[PDB]
């Protein structure tokens, strides 16, 4: 339903339409905030 075609390793929040990879976390934009998996 929402395609996230890119993943970006950065200490800053990249974009709504990319996945935010910081040290041991995989955050993405959901419900207006960043939700970490795991």
């Amino acid at each position: 339903m929402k395609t996230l075609r890119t993943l970006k390793i950065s200490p800053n929040a990249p974009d709504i339409n990319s996945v935010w990879l910081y040290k041991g976390t995989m955050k993405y934009f959901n419900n207006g905030e960043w939700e970490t998996i795991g």
């Binding site: 200490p11 800053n12 929040a13 934009f29 207006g32 905030e33 960043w34």
Partner: protein
């Protein structure tokens, strides 16, 4: 300054309220003179070259007579408080460049179409406190402003510590971060500045501004990082420079209009207002009507300025001497 006239404006400086004529000996003295029947009113005042009487006010033809408390003619220097709002983030975000743009208007020209923008930028870090951000943002403003070798800056940047909360730390281009030693700075004050003034040539003006913020992105959305709130003003510009410009214009309705044009060949007009003292003002607006065909009115006004001691004792003595002699009831301020 050039002001408008209702066909004339005469100004007389009140330095000492003498009780009658032949007591006027020093320049600046004034007596309000009227007859027993209270039909005509005039002021015999000691000019710097002799006794001079004003134009006679027909007391059946006075449109208004009102006085100004000299607190209503002082301009308040606007203060703006710059804070990080709690809605976006009350702490500086670690990767965002925080830019504060000051948007001036009525810069060198005379219109709001003359706009000037000065900036202040801070890129925040991981362990930056909100108090350490206000120390760096005020200094980054004090490098782009306060850089003028010529004159005073367009605004003055201050810092309030939360422990003090009423005394403002001044931030200059000389000020480094070692000089600001507090750990609880909570806001930035961007205050107006008094512009230069020279008598009769440069009028008193001000440069209004607005602290404006650029968007940072915190929760994925570009949010304005701060809030500019106008604090009530704590600094005033006194009534000295406006009355000295007022006497300059209104002594050409009585004396010389060539105020230094062919420069060695001039008439010098001695002014009695010093520009470093506050002045209460008293305006009396009257007219003249003639008989049988000339029913048109020649409206006039007579301005009286008196120095202020705070308790308004010089103007209230001058008003009370007029109300005895003239019979009008001017409201004492």
């Amino acid at each position: 300054m050039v002001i408008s006239i209702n066909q004339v404006r005469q100004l007389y400086v009140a330095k000492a309220l003498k009780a009658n004529t032949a007591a006027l000996t020093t320049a600046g003295d004034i007596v309000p003179k009227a007859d027993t029947a209270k039909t005509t009113l005039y002021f015999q005042s000691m000019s710097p070259a002799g006794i001079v009487a004003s134009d006679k006010i027909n007391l059946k033809h006075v449109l208004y007579a009102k006085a100004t408390p000299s607190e209503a003619l002082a301009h308040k220097l606007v203060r703006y408080s710059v804070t990080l709002d709690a809605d976006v983030s009350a702490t500086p975000v670690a990767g965002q460049n925080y830019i504060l743009r000051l948007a001036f208007r009525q810069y060198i020209g005379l219109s709001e179409e003359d706009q000037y923008f000065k900036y202040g930028e801070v890129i925040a870090r991981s362990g930056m406190t909100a108090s350490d951000f206000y120390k760096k943002m005020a200094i980054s403003l004090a490098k782009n402003l306060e850089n003028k070798t010529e004159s005073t800056p367009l605004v003055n940047i201050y810092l309030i510590s939360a422990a003090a909360a009423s005394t403002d730390v001044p931030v200059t281009s000389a000020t480094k971060e070692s000089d600001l030693t507090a750990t609880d700075y909570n806001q930035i004050i961007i205050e107006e500045t008094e512009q230069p003034w020279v008598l009769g040539m440069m009028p008193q003006a001000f440069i209004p501004f607005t602290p404006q913020f650029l968007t940072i992105t915190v929760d994925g959305e570009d949010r304005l990082w701060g809030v500019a709130t106008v604090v009530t003003p704590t600094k005033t510009v006194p009534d000295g420079h406006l009355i000295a410009d007022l006497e300059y214009f209104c002594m050409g309705a009585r004396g010389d209009i060539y105020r230094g044009m062919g420069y060695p060949n001039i008439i010098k007009t001695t002014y009695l207002v010093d520009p470093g003292a506050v002045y209460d003002v008293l305006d009396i607006h009257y007219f003249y009507t003639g008989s049988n065909e000339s029913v048109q009115k020649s409206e006039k006004t007579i301005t009286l300025v008196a120095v202020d001691d705070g308790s308004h004792t010089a103007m209230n003595a001058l008003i009370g001497a007029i109300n005895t002699a003239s019979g009008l009831t001017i409201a004492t301020l």
